Design a protein around this ligand. Structure first.
Ligand SMILES: *[C@@H]1O[C@H](CO)[C@@H](O[C@@H]2O[C@H](CO)[C@@H](O[C@@H]3O[C@H](CO[C@H]4O[C@H](CO[C@H]5O[C@H](CO)[C@@H](O)[C@H](O)[C@@H]5O)[C@@H](O)[C@H](O)[C@@H]4O)[C@@H](O)[C@H](O[C@H]4O[C@H](CO)[C@@H](O)[C@H](O)[C@@H]4O[C@H]4O[C@H](CO)[C@@H](O)[C@H](O)[C@@H]4O)[C@@H]3O)[C@H](O)[C@H]2NC(C)=O)[C@H](O)[C@H]1NC(C)=O
Ligand SMILES: *[C@@H]1O[C@H](CO)[C@@H](O[C@@H]2O[C@H](CO)[C@@H](O[C@@H]3O[C@H](CO[C@H]4O[C@H](CO)[C@@H](O)[C@H](O)[C@@H]4O)[C@@H](O)[C@H](O)[C@@H]3O)[C@H](O)[C@H]2NC(C)=O)[C@H](O)[C@H]1NC(C)=O
Ligand SMILES: *[C@@H]1O[C@H](CO)[C@@H](O[C@@H]2O[C@H](CO)[C@@H](O[C@@H]3O[C@H](CO)[C@@H](O)[C@H](O)[C@@H]3O)[C@H](O)[C@H]2NC(C)=O)[C@H](O)[C@H]1NC(C)=O
Ligand SMILES: *[C@@H]1O[C@H](CO)[C@@H](O[C@@H]2O[C@H](CO)[C@@H](O[C@@H]3O[C@H](CO)[C@@H](O)[C@H](O)[C@@H]3O)[C@H](O)[C@H]2NC(C)=O)[C@H](O)[C@H]1NC(C)=O
Ligand SMILES: *[C@@H]1O[C@H](CO)[C@@H](O[C@@H]2O[C@H](CO)[C@@H](O)[C@H](O)[C@H]2NC(C)=O)[C@H](O)[C@H]1NC(C)=O
Ligand SMILES: *[C@@H]1O[C@H](CO)[C@@H](O[C@@H]2O[C@H](CO)[C@@H](O)[C@H](O)[C@H]2NC(C)=O)[C@H](O)[C@H]1NC(C)=O
Ligand SMILES: *[C@@H]1O[C@H](CO)[C@@H](O[C@@H]2O[C@H](CO)[C@@H](O)[C@H](O)[C@H]2NC(C)=O)[C@H](O)[C@H]1NC(C)=O
Ligand SMILES: *[C@@H]1O[C@H](CO)[C@@H](O[C@@H]2O[C@H](CO)[C@@H](O)[C@H](O)[C@H]2NC(C)=O)[C@H](O)[C@H]1NC(C)=O
Ligand SMILES: *[C@@H]1O[C@H](CO)[C@@H](O[C@@H]2O[C@H](CO)[C@@H](O)[C@H](O)[C@H]2NC(C)=O)[C@H](O)[C@H]1NC(C)=O
Ligand SMILES: *[C@@H]1O[C@H](CO)[C@@H](O[C@@H]2O[C@H](CO)[C@@H](O)[C@H](O)[C@H]2NC(C)=O)[C@H](O)[C@H]1NC(C)=O
Ligand SMILES: *[C@@H]1O[C@H](CO)[C@@H](O[C@@H]2O[C@H](CO)[C@@H](O)[C@H](O)[C@H]2NC(C)=O)[C@H](O)[C@H]1NC(C)=O
Ligand SMILES: *[C@@H]1O[C@H](CO)[C@@H](O[C@@H]2O[C@H](CO)[C@@H](O)[C@H](O)[C@H]2NC(C)=O)[C@H](O)[C@H]1NC(C)=O
Ligand SMILES: *[C@@H]1O[C@H](CO)[C@@H](O[C@@H]2O[C@H](CO)[C@@H](O)[C@H](O)[C@H]2NC(C)=O)[C@H](O)[C@H]1NC(C)=O
Ligand SMILES: *[C@@H]1O[C@H](CO)[C@@H](O[C@@H]2O[C@H](CO)[C@@H](O)[C@H](O)[C@H]2NC(C)=O)[C@H](O)[C@H]1NC(C)=O
Ligand SMILES: *[C@@H]1O[C@H](CO)[C@@H](O)[C@H](O)[C@H]1NC(C)=O
Ligand SMILES: *[C@@H]1O[C@H](CO)[C@@H](O)[C@H](O)[C@H]1NC(C)=O
Ligand SMILES: *[C@@H]1O[C@H](CO)[C@@H](O)[C@H](O)[C@H]1NC(C)=O
Ligand SMILES: *[C@@H]1O[C@H](CO)[C@@H](O)[C@H](O)[C@H]1NC(C)=O
Ligand SMILES: *[C@@H]1O[C@H](CO)[C@@H](O)[C@H](O)[C@H]1NC(C)=O
Lengths: 434, 118, 118, 118
């Protein structure tokens, strides 16, 4: 029992920690001409053969709701968008009274407007035309006098015409002294001890896909639909449902669009929607009815395990398109699709969609962005991998959620935790210094 | 790395070398990365300084003076170095770090260096 | 500094103190300089950490265990420390550095610390 | 900290632990603070490097070779370690620091390490 203090260094223990993770990208497939916003060309390539180490006999407690990786990812995404939009041309010179008539959507939603704009020499103005979607144009008068929708609240910035916003899976890696732990429990919900925990050099890549009511292009649950909620009895919480099978969604912009490049100053270019070629058609999304119903039958079945009540689904209740519709980006275009036929035979469900160009991202009102037109037609294929639901008796009512973008990454980052290494400690020995 | 995290503290001593070894644009993103480099260095040095003052600078395992208390641990060495793991040990002895470090740092540095000069 | 760079490796062992000693606005220009300072520190520390794990922390010349291979060198020590220079030596053993370092880090850290506690 | 700053140099040898121990947004305010942290690290390391080259890395008090000059000090150890304080001592030996450091670095480094290999 002649036990003396021994100092140990390199002791394999850790504590929960909040630190800064760094960007890593496995793909270096893209060049520097494509200019993807996530192609930072500042961040390190990943290790093509990363090492995952299983920690036997450990029981790490995970918590997706208090996870700080979600907030960090959120902040960095906002930052990258502002950094890439900042240097481009402002559209504040277009905040003028618009003279508008309808396009020949004749025998609706596209307006043909004229402007008086400043040319490179300040004493001269030119009369120009552009087409606009109704959602971006607000009547001023009872006469045909309109304004751009956000000129009465803030500046509008044009998105850079050469910057791509197509998601690239981004890996989040820890700095030296830190480690990322992950849970490998197939039935694991948002919180609790994980009996199978491994340590990784870093996370897999997560694509920064933006969506609202439906979660697109994410990962799947391995065995069953897993429903994760911070507080399952609190109707105000978002319920995140991860599917164990994907559903394909086919979206398109059937019109052949054109682009008009308009000078609005000395190197200040504006990209206007040009003429419409061919038929005027409505944008839409295609979801197979049978896959949709099968999926929803299983979602209710699993939800019933928590409520023991009849479960029904209803359409979104109201509010701005950003909340009431399935808002997503595809190909650089911004779609707002109706989901009333989903949340409510053997055909395909066709959802009408609306398109708008002036976007207030992440509820930051006053930071409006103008999305320039894309020429030609748009074809999108995406995977529905999950749902965001909220709740409103012997029957429970679920409705599409969304709005808060944090939930979209929380749904992927639930598997990871950040801890820091604390290599020093002491224990008794029979060895003393002398 | 951490392969022995759930293992016997004694056995885990064979990983101390790896556990120690891997400790080492003008944008917001860029400054955050520079901050990360700096804090990693500062954390490293604080541990090295402490090993330094304790007289354990050249060691991963350092035997010092100061006996064990029953108020710190009442277990035999047979549980401690055979049946218990480092995470579990840390769970119990975490409340005594501010006692033990101070006891080593003053007493075993000052008494020892004075005798060495003399 | 580097006066003996083209000289005999043996003779150059007498210049190690200088070679070791000289290792130590909100603008773009300013951040580049700060970044450079941090990186210099990291390089210094990495070498010190490695000497530390090898048990060579207090030495410029450190004798360790692990014998030489014929694949590493087929020259006698008489050629090596008399006619060869450090640049020439580096040219020959450059492809065995990872090998030698691994051999030292594990074998000579574990055998020595385990026996010292015992 | 500095409690013995005005006291006897000998007595102050018991306070070296604390004196040695407490040495460790994208705005201009933020960069200045980061620069300050980097400097503190650099200063710390320069002192450690010097103790290292002198063979004093593990010590707060390090006895070396090189006798004292009458040109450096003409006082006995009885005044120096009993009546004088560290501030007063620094006032007298301030002009000899470069001399002493140079002598130690070359002589006591290279002669000693060469003899040890041999
Ligand atoms: C969920 O995941 C899914 C699955 O990944 C995502 O779905 C993908 O989304 C992609 C982006 O929306 C989409 O990619 C576009 O596809 C268009 C049509 O594809 C046909 O033609 C390509 C030709 O490929 C070859 O040429 C390109 C040119 O760069 C090369 O890059 C390739 O390597 C090849 O050499 C075929 O490969 C396809 O099989 C089809 O036949 C393309 O036209 C489009 O390219 C243009 O836009 C790019 C945007 O970055 C740009 O980089 C590229 O250079 C092109 O733009 C130039 O040319 C046009 C021509 O008018 C010009 O106007 C521009 O100014 C510029 O000069 C993309 O390649 C994927 O096809 C799609 N996958 C599927 C199965 O549909 C889904 O988006 C994601 N969902 C969510 C919500 O995130
Ligand atoms: C949206 O509308 C656009 C404008 O009409 C469409 O572009 C047109 O697409 C047709 C496809 O048949 C092209 O016709 C072919 O042209 C090539 C020769 O092209 C080259 O020479 C022409 C001369 O004007 C030049 O304009 C082109 O840029 C090329 O240099 C012929 O060899 C073929 O036989 C055939 O005639 C049109 O030329 C093309 N017009 C333009 C201005 O590009 C666009 O395809 C439509 N998009 C969709 C999705 O429907
Ligand atoms: C998705 O598309 C559906 C229809 O396909 C939209 O539902 C329709 O919404 C309008 C809202 O004005 C309803 O009109 C109102 O109906 C009530 C009925 O009493 C009437 O009193 C009001 O004066 C007004 O006419 C319309 O009836 C309703 N259609 C159906 C079949 O219910 C839905 O709003 C679209 N959602 C999104 C997010 O775009
Ligand atoms: C939506 O989810 C489905 C099901 O996971 C996806 O289908 C799968 O897509 C991957 C793409 O890498 C296929 O992997 C590769 O397929 C090629 C085919 O020649 C094969 O040679 C490669 O070795 C590799 O297996 C995978 O097989 C395919 N699964 C099935 C059952 O076809 C679909 O792509 C997803 N859609 C979206 C928009 O992400
Ligand atoms: C615990 O999690 C680990 C992953 O960390 C699982 O190990 C993987 O198992 C699959 C099975 O095919 C192998 O292909 C992988 O190569 C294994 N990965 C590693 C890192 O070894 C393990 O099977 C899980 N165990 C349980 C009980 O779920
Ligand atoms: C622009 O404003 C004018 C009137 O302020 C709109 O009406 C036109 O007025 C001129 C006056 O000479 C008539 O010759 C045109 O025939 C009128 N147009 C129509 C359709 O009656 C004009 O429509 C407005 N619209 C645009 C896009 O310029
Ligand atoms: C700004 O737009 C207005 C229309 O909204 C232009 O006013 C018309 O200009 C034409 C030019 O000959 C006149 O014939 C019309 O009578 C004007 N309308 C009215 C109601 O008087 C105005 O000229 C444009 N400014 C510039 C610089 O083009
Ligand atoms: C300036 O913007 C504010 C909103 O910040 C406008 O107020 C609301 O605008 C919406 C747009 O559809 C209307 O539906 C609301 O009814 C408006 N509020 C009220 C109380 O009527 C405001 O009207 C905008 N200014 C102008 C001149 O349109
Ligand atoms: C998944 O959710 C279930 C609850 O539906 C968790 O079970 C525990 O339930 C009791 C009931 O009193 C709570 O007090 C516990 O706090 C719940 N556990 C947790 C971690 O909160 C189940 O444990 C959850 N998943 C995991 C991985 O444990
Ligand atoms: C979900 O949250 C609600 C409240 O947000 C919890 O239930 C209520 O908690 C408040 C706290 O002051 C009490 O005053 C109420 O009386 C509680 N409600 C009831 C019916 O007792 C609820 O327990 C949480 N549920 C889960 C699963 O975490
Ligand atoms: C979405 O688009 C894809 C691609 O065309 C459709 O996949 C095709 O489906 C038909 C149906 O029998 C198959 O014969 C084709 O071979 C499939 N093509 C490919 C490339 O797999 C998919 O069915 C569409 N989804 C919807 C809802 O219409
Ligand atoms: C997790 O605990 C198990 C059980 O103690 C460890 O398995 C033992 O490993 C030793 C190694 O010499 C064997 O002698 C025992 O016979 C094994 N026990 C059984 C029941 O097979 C396992 O190695 C531990 N893993 C970690 C990381 O500690
Ligand atoms: C470059 O090489 C020459 C000879 O190859 C070195 O000169 C020798 O220096 C030693 C010093 O004791 C003398 O004993 C030899 O006699 C000299 N050799 C000749 C041929 O004169 C010279 O010092 C070397 N310089 C460096 C930096 O290595
Ligand atoms: C300042 O100087 C005074 C005396 O000059 C110090 O006081 C002495 O403290 C020792 C402590 O053992 C006593 O034995 C002496 O008798 C004291 N001297 C007198 C005259 O009382 C005092 O401690 C010094 N303070 C510092 C910081 O050096
Ligand atoms: C999960 O996917 C598998 C795939 O075969 C399927 O058999 C299983 O029934 C699915 N479970 C749910 C709840 O969708
Ligand atoms: C959709 O909602 C309408 C509301 O009247 C209802 O009549 C219809 O049956 C619903 N469709 C489905 C598939 O539930
Ligand atoms: C144990 O802690 C008590 C607390 O007062 C202390 O007095 C005693 O000396 C300690 N024993 C050891 C071995 O440190
Ligand atoms: C020399 O290389 C051979 C090749 O495998 C190796 O087996 C042997 O142990 C090496 N000797 C030394 C000193 O490393
Ligand atoms: C004292 O200074 C003289 C000046 O030349 C020097 O020669 C002598 O060696 C020095 N003594 C010591 C102890 O360095």
């Amino acid at each position: 029992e002649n036990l003396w203090v021994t100092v140990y260094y390199g002791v394999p223990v850790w504590k929960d920690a909040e630190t800064t993770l760094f960007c890593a990208s496995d793909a270096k497939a893209y060049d520097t001409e494509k200019r993807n916003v996530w192609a930072t060309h500042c961040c390190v390539p990943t290790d093509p053969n990363p090492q995952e180490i299983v920690l036997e006999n450990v029981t790490e407690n995970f918590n997706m709701w208090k996870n700080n990786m979600v907030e960090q990812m959120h902040t960095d995404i906002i930052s990258l968008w502002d950094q890439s939009l900042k240097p481009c041309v402002k559209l504040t010179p277009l905040c003028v009274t618009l003279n508008c008539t309808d396009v020949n959507a004749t025998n609706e939603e596209i307006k043909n407007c004229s402007f008086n704009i400043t040319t490179e020499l300040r004493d001269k103005k030119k009369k120009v035309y552009a087409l606009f979607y109704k959602l971006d144009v607000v009547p001023i008068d009872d006469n045909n006098s309109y304004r751009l929708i956000n000129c009465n609240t803030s500046a509008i910035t044009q998105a850079c015409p050469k910057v791509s916003f197509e998601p690239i899976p981004i890996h989040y890696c820890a700095p030296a002294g830190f480690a990322i732990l992950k849970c490998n429990d197939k039935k694991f919900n948002g919180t609790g001890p994980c009996k199978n925990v491994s340590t990784v050099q870093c996370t897999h890549g997560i694509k920064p896909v933006v969506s609202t009511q439906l979660l697109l292009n994410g990962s799947l649950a391995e065995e069953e639909i897993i429903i994760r909620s911070e507080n399952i009895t609190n109707n105000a919480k978002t319920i995140i449902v991860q599917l164990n099978e994907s559903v394909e969604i086919n979206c398109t912009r059937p019109n052949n669009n054109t682009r008009k490049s308009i000078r609005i100053g000395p190197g200040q270019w504006f990209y206007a929607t040009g003429d419409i070629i061919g038929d005027i058609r409505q944008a839409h999304c295609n979801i197979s009815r049978t896959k949709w119903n099968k999926t929803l039958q299983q979602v209710a079945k699993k939800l019933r395990e928590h409520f023991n009540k009849t479960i029904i689904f209803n359409p979104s209740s109201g509010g701005d398109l950003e909340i009431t519709t399935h808002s997503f980006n595809c190909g650089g275009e911004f779609f707002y699709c109706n989901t009333s036929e989903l949340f409510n035979t053997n055909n395909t469900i066709t959802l009408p969609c609306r398109i708008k160009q002036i976007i207030n991202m992440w509820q930051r009102v006053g930071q409006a962005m103008y999305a320039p037109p894309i020429e030609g037609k748009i074809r999108c294929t995406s995977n529905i991998t999950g749902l965001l639901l909220t709740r409103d008796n012997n029957t429970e009512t679920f409705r599409p959620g969304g709005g808060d973008m944090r939930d979209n990454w929380r749904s992927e980052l639930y598997k990871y935790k950040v801890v820091k290494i604390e290599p020093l400690g002491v224990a008794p020995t029979r060895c003393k210094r002398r | 790395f951490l392969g022995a995290a759930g293992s016997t503290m004694g056995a885990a001593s064979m990983t101390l070398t790896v556990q120690a070894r891997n400790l080492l644009q003008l944008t917001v993103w860029g400054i955050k990365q520079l901050q990360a480099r700096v804090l990693a260095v500062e954390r490293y040095l604080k541990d090295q300084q402490l090993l330094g003052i304790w007289g354990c600078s050249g060691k991963l395992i350092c035997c010092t003076n100061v006996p064990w208390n029953s108020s710190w641990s009442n277990k035999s060495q047979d549980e401690i170095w055979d049946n218990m793991t480092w995470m579990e040990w840390d769970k119990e002895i975490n409340n005594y770090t501010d006692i033990i470090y101070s006891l080593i740092e003053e007493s075993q540095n000052q008494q020892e260096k004075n005798e060495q000069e003399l």
